[PDB]
Amino acid sequence: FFKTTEMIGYVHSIDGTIATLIPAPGNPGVAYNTIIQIQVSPTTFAAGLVFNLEKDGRIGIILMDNITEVQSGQKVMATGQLLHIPVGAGVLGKVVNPLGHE
Amino acid sequence: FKTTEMIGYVHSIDGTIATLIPAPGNPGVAYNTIIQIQVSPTTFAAGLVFNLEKDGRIGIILMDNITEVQSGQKVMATGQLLHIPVGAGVLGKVVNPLGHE
Amino acid sequence: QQRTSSLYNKTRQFGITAALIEILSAMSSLEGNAMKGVRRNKFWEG
Amino acid sequence: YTPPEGLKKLYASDFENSKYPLNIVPSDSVLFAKFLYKAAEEKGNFDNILSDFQKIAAAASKLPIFWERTAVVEKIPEFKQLSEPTFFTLVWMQNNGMLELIQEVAEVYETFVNAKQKKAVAKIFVAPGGEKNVEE
Secondary structure, eight states, rough: OOOOOOOOEEEEEETTTEEEEOOOOOOOOOOOTEEEEEEEEETEEEEEEEEEEOOOSSSSEESOGGGOOOOOTTTTEEEESOOOOSSSSTTTTTTOTSOOOO | OOOOOOEEEEEEEEEEEEEEOOOOOOOOOOHHHHHESSSSSOOOOOEEEEOOOTTTTEEEEEOOTTOOTTTOOOEEEOOOOOOOSSSSSTTTTTTTTSSSE | OOOHHHHHHHHHHHHHHHHHHHHHHHHHHHHOOOOOOOOHHHHHTO | OOOOHHHHHHHHGGGSSOSSSSOOOOOHHHHHHHHHHHHHHHHTTOHHHHHHHHHHHHHHSSSOOOTTSOTTTOOSSGGSOOOHHHHHHHHHHHHTTTTTGHHHHHHHHHHHHHHTTTTOOOOEEEEEEEOOOOOO
């Protein structure tokens, strides 16, 4: 009865709007083109998209939000799902981001 | 130029550029300084430091006696930037960028 | 004729340079992304 | 350096393709850690390697900054007390110039040991100085 996420590794390097991740040994691993959450704080997360899966195990991440909050050594959780956004007649007349945030 | 201590040995030579592998203990070389490669026991060629690599390798731009430079030769560090003679004692003379007449 | 010839000779020079730079930027990337693995040899035997 | 015969024989084998408790993706550190695990498995003792890493970590705290780039494990007296497998690996790294991976090869080796011994480690992340209470 816990909201258990799926930690897959840590943040190794940051170059502007992209990042790289090193997987912790013996972890489930992340899937290609999936969304991941970088724990910038015990309650705040930054969205990233998987772009590369290298032989070394390193993962290429495209950051989407809260980039300034991202630092090397932070934890990363894997949602294990592709990108889904709100859709319906309730969004008409509104300004939104690609992530669906109004 | 006044030498202080050896700071490594010549490793590679690609035309007018060169690389230096560190001497034991990695004494270190200040960036953008002038170094003296012991091409001969009494002759030292001039080089300019332009890169300090993480491994300890130094990037050198050779200035003169490039042909004489060979891999394995010792390199000494002046510890100072390039300084050249200036004043009325140089007027009417022909010099090179290193200050040699 | 003297103004369009210069633009033609200036264009071919730029075209050659842009291509070779572009090829040699995709050669650097391939080399940079690649690296030499752990050297498995008798290091002690030296 | 005069490595022992057992390590020499193993170092020439394709141990990288052998079976291991876990299937970790190949890496620079992982090859180093697999070698230690394979060598220790033959003797059956794994805690010796862990002690060696502990000594290395303690010794490194006193070494000068950037000691991994001027490192000579043979001349360093702190590493003279290490086991043959660990000492061989350190020399092997110093030859590859990857002595900065010491703190990561150890993590992989511990993971293999825990998997082999059937131990599950739970990381408890706590605030600095807040580790006093861990009952929950």
